[model samples]
Target: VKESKQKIHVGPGELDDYYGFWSGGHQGEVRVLGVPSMRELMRIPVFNVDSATGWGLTNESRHIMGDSAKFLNGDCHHPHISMTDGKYDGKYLFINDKANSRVARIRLDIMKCDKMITVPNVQAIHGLRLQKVPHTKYVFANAEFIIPHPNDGKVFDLQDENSYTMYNAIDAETMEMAFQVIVDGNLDNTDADYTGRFAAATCYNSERDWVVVFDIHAVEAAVKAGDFITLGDSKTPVLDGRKKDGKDSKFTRYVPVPKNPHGCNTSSDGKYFIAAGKLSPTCSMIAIDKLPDLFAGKLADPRDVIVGEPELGLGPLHTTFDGRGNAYTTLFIDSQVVKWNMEEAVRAYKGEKVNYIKQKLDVHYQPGHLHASLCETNEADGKWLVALSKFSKDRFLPVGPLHPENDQLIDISGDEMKLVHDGPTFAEPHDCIMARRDQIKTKKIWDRNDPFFAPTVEMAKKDGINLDTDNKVIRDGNKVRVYMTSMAPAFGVQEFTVKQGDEVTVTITNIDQIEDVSWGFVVVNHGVSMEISPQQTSSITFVADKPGLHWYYCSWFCHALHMEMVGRMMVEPA
Candidate 1:
């Protein structure tokens, strides 16, 4: 185990129902937390090699780690839980690997990873920028960079002002890369569930700031007709990135913010689309419905989508919302959470004098990304928020050289925001999301008869690799099979003997039957491992990479005899 810690004994039903899943930044994983109580739950590994639980070292999971070993380390941001009909759905939580352009779909049934997809043709993936559209057909993870078309390997200069940045969309059901959108300029970070009708994003060009807005209705129509309209032969995101004029195109936009914009957090009602010109002193909001008038040349100012602009504080990073028609934003320079009434700001747009600044509370230090419960989508549970801070000089018991970031919890139940709790979290906690316990309702235990279930050898889901003579080594070229079982000090197959170049498949079953008796395998230098649930059979196939004596053992904590749950592998040169 790379990073080992003592076991925590918890009483049954003691853990809180609500949880906050925060991005592990450079740690390349996700850290789960118990809301209200703020206790660490478990770390789900993604981009990083977490040997503690055999995440990357598993046969069934190695493929999910991508083709490059360079992808093993990633910076994850913005953990989004799927929403159904407004509220958080207990189905899945989607997170992205910013460094590797990968997105992982974590199944909530038993809290395990099912699949991961890498954003094709891009340098880095920022926040998946999950915003809502009235009839959304797919979700998109935009590139937070400027890269040339993969066909031609020439990089663009900022002076050239390239608008061919990639934005890939995934199917809602299959979670596959369904389609893509090419912005007209360099797109900065994106945002929200949406302003009622359309979703919000930003395109920050040094020449001009384009407030990027996408009409999913138009996109769904294009997808059905196979109308992946692009001008170039290399398949770009547009019919022509040069001619950007569409009050009605799929991903439409505005002339831009004066300063470089970053986060986009939409209002609950989807009326006001808010974002920070990162370098600006105030926050800006766009009226979604009036966008047509603004673009169609009906409004007095073509940029009339800018109906409300209120000065919140210095260095406004990202904004979060509450249910009572109120919005909260994170101020990086001042290191505080500012709460203001959204409806009031809209009222001011109608010639009414309103106090934009409602309340401001101090966070730990510089805050990056912030979240307010269900406000990201429904605001059904918008009572609290977690300010993911960047600076933590002395926030926690410093583990020397590196210190964990602070997650400052805020109580937004009242009219004004209240700073309630501040806690330390591992690595960089970028974007954190929360959902109520009752909404999740995850299964406390699993069925032994599930897909990977294995009771006795006869009742196993897998046969000795395939029944027949697959029970042991075969000279059928590079193919062999072995069935194994893990007991106390020894596994079913204490040792396996094979020759180099042999493709070996081992079917392992942990008959420990205890509810929490989860078993795993960490094969030395095999680039594979298996996490077998109680009474579950896991099949892992790997080629004998080198001729040597290597060892494999259970990585998960299995009481004191964990190290003894080991096995040996002898690979002879062919």
Candidate 2:
């Protein structure tokens, strides 16, 4: 079976054409494709799209992108997707909608989804990975809670003691969660003190036989603590900031070679594991063979191996390897994908090579965004790469020049690579992986049913009024009342009439029916956009927040074609 020779255009209404966009806000569960054919192979929209439910100002409400979707389900904003080989069973895409605080699975055979499975007492599931042992199939997921702090102000606190648990499912013909493994450590003793913010990026290393967890909280804690106390190995402070007494604190800790771990992978030989630091702008490799004692334990010290030096950038979401042992990694913030020879990259102290055979591809297709996952494929004696961009190119507010004209597909095998495909099709190409056709073929096809759809306004008396009657708007002394409904086609402020200096409270509510849908709403020029979820409401109260003719629409998931999902807010001068 060869790759499809089709060019598909995916958007809000065209479910049959192209797949939905992958968002960063949601944990990367927007679009999942088996191979690089343009049509709607498979897609899972973020849990909430209309600001209807969950906690206020949640990532479930922000835009998503990248290959994070390929591995799991949920918005690019948070951790979603449980586990399963998408090839063997596409139905295993489970989303942990943080806003809704539940898990839902997508039945790809029917192009429909199931009601979210409630996980009592849990706030968010941060990372997910799949592991298949002899008789039992395991799907490991990490959960965390959001907490307020004094230093960082507010952070995702890891409360595994009471709030965190790893869900385990029995992988049979049909997906069923058999049991769950609750983390039994001091939940309060997270990487952070005030808040156990252990939520970041994660991966499973087959070679090393261990779950590699990226503890951003741990890094921050080490940095903060290193400021006061001396580190075990290094004498200097880990962070270079001002002290409580207002003195210049240049304390630098060992700064473990692998700082702020984000994404990680193990080599086929099980001798090495590579990890991307989300903040350091560099990727590091750990030697599992050398850390025998650590490998024997449940969790190893994150500062084990320091393979590669720092690379300037942010959000290196995922990395992959080819048959030739070459490695490819994606930088979400830099909007670029870099290819490095694993062996060579480890040898170089600075991870730099004049001719180490590296290729840099632009992710500006959707500017102000980045690509999530990367996978390399060999075809016709050449190598090809595919990436997931969670956010749409057109969704960037203030629309920058770097915005990508279309999703990208580049042929890197030739001397000078050429862009083979590009178009305004993908909302966000989240996580993607190669699959065998035989693995996905099924005898029965499910019904074409849409669980929920945004209700359209039969009559909009106002020229630019975008309102879903299903939403409620509160009236408070000349302030407009508005509700954000999930699954609503457009994301904007409709029928809003405000007066200067009048504080307005616009509450976006996530209805139960649409709680699982992920989306964001924003007033374009006004710089007012709030990401909300089902059953969750985010209210913005300010004296007009600024008065003017402002453009507002859904800035989260890709709602490009649904013009009705947008509207305007008029603020009259006092």
Candidate 3:
């Protein structure tokens, strides 16, 4: 334990080696944690209401949310970043909202959710992944729950085999729905190979589950040839891959695996796609190189693609790589991480008596997703591994009835895996990914011409006002527009007079160029508040109902005279 603590401890004012982006589960946000140290750094709001950042309240945020803002809560599952040439590009991170069937993209530079699109003809958007190699052109999302095409309460039957879910591919650049593929069974976790030509997803909710593989080039060719269908009101082209005979359909090939499989992950060497057996004890490894022949009808059986099905342990939920031919699988029921050799497992599957089982280290509790540093990309360092355990019972001091989950850090540099640190997390955290510190590049301050707040800037132009230097209120027939600038300790408009029953729109632009100098606008008794970051603009709207002097102040602490940062809104009776 002493040696393990030394690996995670970073004295005072020291930094960690990797950056972790963890899913907030039902919290509807993404938590940024520093690897090794296991310290929570920042929270990026998505599919949820954030009071501090005014994410769901601001005009710009609501514009991105569209109709998804009606939902109060969201269940965020997988958090995966964009990749270029099978490596982390740190451009954007994609997350899924299973609660509302939505997918959101967060910009890495600003660490903010810039785009959100709700998938049509699907109920729950689970299991999300990005296309690797070349670039992340498509964001693949799997629909978990099976529903009917005209899901307008017309027919509700579970026994109906016609009711099915879709495999959706979204354009990463335009955030548009590229196309949807109709597949058999229910889809679970998904992953893409290094070639970028193929992707696979685990299908559970059946006696004998399937690991369905898709040929991306074939699907696009079929769509381009106008050989698809338009379901219901959705104009998105949908291709039928339900016939998994692998003879006629060139779009998809189904490899039948026993029992219900959970996660489908690719090996670091880009050789095999390993499917985790959730109910069964063995993990199925399908060779990536043999996929082309299998799709070309040369391989007789789809099961012939399977090279190994090594029995790891009970409840093998997920798998990670060390970039050295070693694979680590998380056993939920046993509460342990099993380290085994990949080639040895294949040898053991081929009737050779070579033992592939390495050392299995016991964790705190029931762990869900375990990931090593850069495990999702080709640059897997395998220095640190994070185990996301479900229950933290008796691990930390008791606070209340609702206990926090524990995220443990393990040192994987040596042969034996050693548990280093344990950090408490809220609600649930499904999965996490770590990247090197130098991989991600963030801006010190927002740019003046940033497209994030360009809509608000255009609104200012329509009212014949300049947001940078204007501190005037324009009345356009019961509609008042208050445009002001925020330096540090004060708002430009000290007191703006407005009549009762008028709709007031307040806009504040943070003119401060220094980094980390943020300001907030909160009007007391008016239920209006927003955050203005450095060199950024923010706006909110409310009604001036009560006739009185309402005090407005900065919520974020800035400068020594922060308490003096106050303004007044004079409301007149109509």
RMSD of each: 6.0, 15.1, 1.9
Q: How accurate is candidate 1 locally (lDDT)?
A: 0.68
- Candidate of highest lDDT: 3
Largest TM-score belongs to which candidate? 3
lDDT tens per residue, model 3, 517-554: 99998889877777899989999988999998989999
TM-score of each: 0.85, 0.46, 0.97
lDDT of 2 at 300: 49
Model 1 misplacement above 4 A: 1-13, 66-70, 131-136, 154-163, 192-197, 229-251, 292-300, 444-475, 487-490, 500-503, 523-529, 539-552, 559-564, 568-574
lDDT of 1 by residue, 1-574 (tens): 1121212333567766578787788888887888867787888777788666556655545655557444568888878777655556767777777777787777777666667877766667774755354423355677777766643547555344443566667765576676676666666666544432455567676433766776555665676777765534434333222333433343455545656777777777767778776788677788777776654557765366787777778889888887767788889999998888877876786788778677898888999888887876755456778898988887677688877788887777766666767788777878888888777766544554542122233523343343211334334567766776665566777788888888887767676756777778767887766677665566677888799898988877776877677888899987
Q: Which candidate, 2 or 3, has the higher TM-score?
A: 3
Better of 1 and 2 by TM-score: 1
Q: Write down the TM-score for model 2.
A: 0.46
What digit string (tens of lDDT, one per residue) describes model 2 on residues 1-574?
2332333334555433112223324433445443334454544444543222221222222212122222234343322222222112333444444444444555444333433443433345544444321211433344444322211334445432222233222233233433332322211101100112212123221112222332323334554554333222323222222122423122111114334455545443334556666555676666554443332343344354455553535667566554355556677787776766666766675545534446666665323222222221121122444554545545344355443224555454443334555434322334333333433333131111222221112111231324333455556576554654555565433667678776555555444344336456666654355645444344444457567776666655534555556777778887
Clashes of each: 12, 79, 0
Q: Give the residue spans of candidate 2 off by over 4 A.
A: 1-37, 41-91, 114-116, 132-136, 144-258, 266-272, 288-292, 295-302, 310-315, 332-334, 349-357, 365-384, 389-406, 412-418, 423-430, 444-574
Which wins on TM-score, candidate 1 or candidate 3?
Answer: 3
